[PDB]
Design a protein around this ligand. Structure first.
Ligand SMILES: *Cc1c(COP(=O)(O)O)cnc(C)c1O
Ligand SMILES: *Cc1c(COP(=O)(O)O)cnc(C)c1O
Ligand SMILES: [Cl-]
Ligand SMILES: [Cl-]
Lengths: 405, 405
C-alpha cells in the first residue's frame, strides 16, 4: 500500500515556502511537480552521456539512440500499445492533436463531412478541429453537457451519421474530473466507420490505461502532467492507420532520400513523424517518470487519490455558499466558486495563504459558458497531496467567506 | 582573452572515457555538450520553482511566467532583435522553418511563384520548401556550388525574377563550414520584393549575430547546438511580417476567445504561435546557455576557434591521401574523406580510439551528390576542444591509413 510521506520526500519543491508560508501545491492538473529521480535522470544524461541521436557511429551517439528507443518501448508498455512503433514523440498533447488534425485530418475529412467533439473539451482538443473544418469545409458537432458535468449521451443518435469521420473526446475532464465512458462511445463511433482520438492528458496519472482494451485509434498525453519534464509528450496511433499517414513536419531524419531534381521520399513510421533533433533530454526524463510511477503502482495511486478526494468533498461541505461543478465521482480535480466572489479574488487570497490553486477559464471557455460563469477555481488533489493540505484549503475558503461576505 | 582549460572544467562530459580511453568529442556540430551552469539552471528550476506558466494567479506560476519572458528578452538582445516580441519559442531550427513554410508560405507563395534555396542546405532547410512548393504549385530553384564549397553567386541573375517570393539560405554550412555573404544576398533579394529566411543553426555559437544589420526577415537557430538543452530553439521574425502571419498550431494559450457557435479568435504575436504548455525547462536552460556564452564573449570564442582551426588544417597536411571539402576559411567544421576508405569505416576506427566524429550524409544529401561521394567524415572544432585533440585526430588518421592502405 501507499505512503504519502515517503512519496513527498522525493519531491524537492514540496519543501518550498511561498509568501513566508509552507506551499500547498494544489495545481498539479496544470502541471505536476517532478521527483528528484526524474530531475536527476535528465541531469545525469547531460552530465555523462550526452550526444546527438541519429544512430551515429560513435559510442555516445549510439548509446543515446538506444536510450531513446528504450523509452519509446517503455512508453508503449505503459499504455499497453501492441507495438513500440505505434508511438510518436511530440512536444505534448497539443502538438499531438495538431499532428493528427493535419496529417490524418487533411487526408480523410472532406467538404460535407462532420467531426464530433464534446462541450467539455480543452482548447487543445477544440481549436485544431475548428481549423481543420475551416480548411476542408466540414462541420464541427458538439456533444452537450448535463448539469452534473457528464455528457448528454442521448444526443449521440442525432450527431453520428454516415458522414461522421472522427470523434475527438477527452478521457478525463481537466476542469470537472468527469471520466467519460470511452469504450462504449468508441464501439458506437466504429459502427459508423468513424475514428476516435482520445485526449488522455488528465487520465494517465490517475489509473492504468490500456489502449488495446479501449480500442481507440489515437491517444495523446503530456509528460509534464505525468510528473515528468516539460517539452515532451506521446501520440499513440494504431499501426494500420499510422502507416498510411503522410508526414507533417519536414526535415532531417524523417526522410529516406532527398533529391533536388527527383524529389524526396519518406522513411517508415513512427520516425517519419519526428523531424529534426528530438528532445532527447525530455525523453530521458519521461522514461524516468514512467519508471517512478510504475514503481509506486497506478492502482495504489488511484486508491490513495480516491480516499483523499472523498475526504476533501466531505470536508468542503462545511464551507458556506460553496458551489461545486461536476460529478460526485470526479477524478483528480475539484472545480468550485465561492459565493458570488470572483475566482480571481478567491485564488489570490488562497495564494496569500501559500495555497496554489488555478483560477480562470482553464482553457475551457465553452465549458464556462455552459455553466454561465466567466471563471472557476480548481484544486488538484494528486498523489503527493495530504489531508492537512485539504484542511488548509477548507479553512482558507471559510476565512475568505467571513472576510469578504 | 580565452582559457580553454577553465572552460573545459565547466563541461562534465569531457571527463568521460569511451572504449577505455579519454573522449575527444569532435561532434559539436551535431550537438554541443552543456556546461554545468546550464544543467544546474534547469535542474534547480525543477527543484525549487516549478509551475505552469500561463500568467497563473499563484506565486510559483507568476514567477515562472516572468522567467520565461525574461529569457525571450535575453534571446532578443543576443541576436540584436529590435523587440522581444519578434521571437517565437520553437522546438528547434527544423520546427521554426516548418512554422514559416506553413504560416507565411501558405499565405504568400502562389501557383507559378518560385522559392530559392542553395545546394548546400541541410534537409531542415529543403524539405519544408519542397512540401510548400507541392502544396501551392510553385517552383524550387537552387543556387549551385563551386568546387571549393562556396555558392556560384554568378547564377543569381537567372534565379531571381518578379515571381521570386523567398530566399531560404544557410548562414554557415553544417558540413563545409562555409559562411555565406548574407548581407549582400539579402539586399539583392529585397530588390525583387522577396523575403529571406536565414538558417543560423551553425552560426550563433561562433561569432556575434545581428539581425538588424543582416536585415533578414526570418532567422532560426537551435538551443542544443548553442551549449543548451534539447527541445528548444528560437524563430526571429520582423514585427511587421509576424503581426500579419496566421497561426500554425492551434490550442490553448494562443487564442483570445474560443466559441463553439461563434468561432475562435487569436491572441497577439508572438504568443499566437506558441500553443499548449511551453517547454519551460528548456527555456530556462537556454537562458542560462546564452548567459554562459555571453560571459565568455563571442569574440573571444571566435578568436580561439579560428586559431584552433588554423592549427588543425596545418597539421592535417601530414595525413596522406586526405581529401578536404569546403573553403580554406571554414568555420567550425572540417569535412573530409580518407583515401578511398568509406567514411563509416574511418569513423569507426576513430571511435575505437575514443574520438567522436560524425560520418554519413550529414542531413545534406544534395551536397554529397554535388561532390559525387555517398558520405563524408566531419570533425567539429568547438570552444572546448584542444590542440591535443587535434593531434589525436591527425595521428588516428595516419594510423588508419597505414593499417588499411
Ligand atoms: C542541425 C542543423 C539543423 C537542424 O536543427 P535541429 O535542432 O535538429 O532542428 C538545421 N540547419 C543546420 C545548418 C543545422 O546545423
Ligand atoms: C493540459 C491538458 C492539455 C494540454 O496539454 P499540453 O501539454 O499543454 O500540450 C490538453 N488536454 C487536457 C485534458 C489537458 O489537461
Ligand atoms: Cl536526414
Ligand atoms: Cl487558452
Amino acid at each position: 500500500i501507499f505512503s504519502v510521506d515517503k512519496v513527498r520526500a522525493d519531491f524537492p519543491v514540496l519543501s518550498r515556502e511561498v509568501n513566508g508560508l509552507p506551499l500547498a501545491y494544489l495545481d498539479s492538473a496544470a502541471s505536476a511537480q517532478k521527483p528528484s529521480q526524474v530531475i536527476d535522470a535528465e541531469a545525469e544524461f547531460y552530465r555523462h552521456g550526452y550526444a546527438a541521436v541519429h544512430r551515429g557511429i560513435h559510442t555516445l551517439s549510439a548509446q543515446a539512440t538506444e536510450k531513446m528507443e528504450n523509452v519509446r518501448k517503455r512508453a508503449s508498455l505503459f499504455i499497453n500499445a501492441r507495438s513500440a512503433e505505434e508511438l510518436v514523440f511530440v512536444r505534448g498533447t497539443t502538438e499531438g492533436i495538431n499532428l493528427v488534425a493535419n496529417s490524418w485530418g487533411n487526408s480523410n475529412v472532406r467538404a460535407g463531412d462532420n467531426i464530433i467533439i464534446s462541450q467539455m473539451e480543452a482548447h487543445a482538443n477544440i481549436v485544431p478541429w475548428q481549423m481543420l473544418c475551416a480548411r476542408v469545409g466540414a462541420e464541427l458537432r458538439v456533444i452537450p453537457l448535463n448539469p452534473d458535468g457528464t455528457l448528454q449521451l442521448e444526443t449521440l443518435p442525432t450527431l453520428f451519421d454516415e458522414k461522421t469521420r472522427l470523434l475527438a473526446i477527452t478521457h478525463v475532464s481537466n476542469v470537472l474530473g468527469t471520466e467519460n465512458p470511452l469504450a462504449e462511445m468508441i464501439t458506437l463511433a466504429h459502427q459508423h466507420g468513424a475514428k476516435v482520438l482520445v485526449d488522455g492528458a488528465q487520465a494517465v496519472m490517475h489509473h492504468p490505461v490500456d489502449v488495446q482494451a479501449l480500442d481507440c485509434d489515437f491517444y495523446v498525453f503530456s509528460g509534464h502532467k505525468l510528473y515528468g519534464p516539460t517539452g515532451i509528450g506521446i501520440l499513440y496511433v494504431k499501426e494500420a492507420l499510422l502507416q498510411e499517414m503522410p508526414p507533417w513536419e519536414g526535415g532531417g531524419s524523417m526522410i529516406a532520400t532527398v533529391s533536388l531534381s527527383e524529389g524526396t521520399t519518406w522513411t517508415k513510421a513512427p520516425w517519419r513523424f519526428e523531424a529534426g533533433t528530438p528532445n532527447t533530454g525530455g525523453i530521458i526524463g519521461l522514461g524516468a517518470a514512467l519508471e517512478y510511477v510504475s514503481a509506486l503502482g497506478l492502482n495504489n495511486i488511484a486508491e490513495y487519490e480516491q480516499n483523499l478526494m472523498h475526504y476533501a468533498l466531505s470536508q468542503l461541505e462545511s464551507v458556506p455558499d460553496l458551489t461545486l461543478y461536476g460529478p460526485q465521482n470526479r477524478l483528480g480535480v475539484i472545480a468550485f466558486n465561492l459565493g458570488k466572489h470572483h475566482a480571481y479574488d478567491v485564488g489570490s487570497f488562497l495564494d496569500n495563504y501559500g495555497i496554489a490553486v488555478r483560477t480562470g477559464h482553464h482553457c475551457a471557455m465553452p465549458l464556462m459558458a455552459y455553466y454561465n460563469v466567466p471563471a472557476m477555481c480548481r484544486a488538484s488533489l494528486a498523489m503527493y497531496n495530504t489531508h492537512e493540505e485539504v484542511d488548509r484549503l477548507v479553512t482558507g475558503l471559510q476565512r475568505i467567506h467571513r472576510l469578504l461576505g
